[PDB]
């Protein structure tokens, strides 16, 4: 019932926070269940 929920999302004027995995695959964002559940940061020596 896709456009049932679509009209509901517009009449609510909803912001999609993009954190369910079915919403990250739609917008192409990386899923965060497993290896996407953290961030890797590189340590650089110079100030």
């Amino acid at each position: 019932t896709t456009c049932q929920f679509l009209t509901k999302a517009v009449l609510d004027n909803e912001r999609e926070q993009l954190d369910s995995p079915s919403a990250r695959i739609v917008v192409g964002k990386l899923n965060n269940v497993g290896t996407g559940s953290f961030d890797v940061l590189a340590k650089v020596p110079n100030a």
Binding site: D39, L41, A42, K43, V44, P45, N46, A47
Partner: protein, 199 residues
């Protein structure tokens, strides 16, 4: 009801600092230091000397070119400072790797010495050549000016043999000329300065 929208456009284009006419030379001031914040990409080959990596990838392509966000010609830079992603200062900072690529993005502060002239400014550059259509000038030995024929007083002629330009008082004009700055152009990668001698 026609003011809450039109106000959003005037302050978008109103320049922050106007150029002042300084030390009573007539010449206005156009060299200005501005602090900026960047969002750049450090690369894996420069992961041992990160300051040299940002300087060689993002800062050196920017010098001596017109930049949109500062409204001027970026002369040089001073004081690069990478923002740490760890709000603990220190040398061993750390930046964030993108998930897909090995590239790391970060924030940086640096002071840009930019050259920002506006309209209504007065500059003194040396005349490169002169003809019976224009006067061409090297502003500060690096920039270019073009005083067109409608922007020259009518009582100033041109003697020909090429040749010197003739003013009203019969003086063949010398290189170091004062001129009023008209609409500064953007169009080519060569960034020129239109001018007037009329007032």
């Amino acid at each position: 009801n026609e003011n809450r929208e039109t106000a959003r456009f005037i302050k978008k284009h109103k320049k922050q600092v106007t150029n002042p006419i300084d030390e009573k030379n007539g010449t206005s001031n156009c060299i200005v230091r501005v602090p900026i914040a960047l969002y750049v990409s450090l690369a894996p080959m420069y992961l041992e000397n990160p300051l040299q990596g940002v300087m060689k990838q993002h800062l050196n392509p920017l010098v001596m070119k017109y930049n949109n966000k500062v409204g001027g010609v970026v002369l040089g830079y001073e004081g690069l400072k990478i923002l740490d992603a760890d709000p603990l200062d220190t040398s061993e900072k750390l930046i964030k790797i993108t998930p897909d690529t090995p590239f790391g993005f970060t924030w940086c502060h640096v002071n840009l010495y930019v050259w920002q002239p506006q309209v209504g400014d007065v500059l003194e550059g040396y005349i490169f050549i002169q003809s019976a259509s224009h006067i061409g000038l090297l502003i500060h030995d690096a920039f270019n000016a073009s005083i067109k024929k409608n922007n020259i007083p009518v009582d100033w002629t041109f003697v020909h043999n090429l040749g010197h330009w003739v003013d009203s008082n019969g003086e063949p004009i010398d290189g170091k000329l004062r001129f009023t700055v008209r609409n500064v152009h953007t169009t080519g990668r060569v960034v020129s300065v239109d001018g007037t001698l009329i007032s």
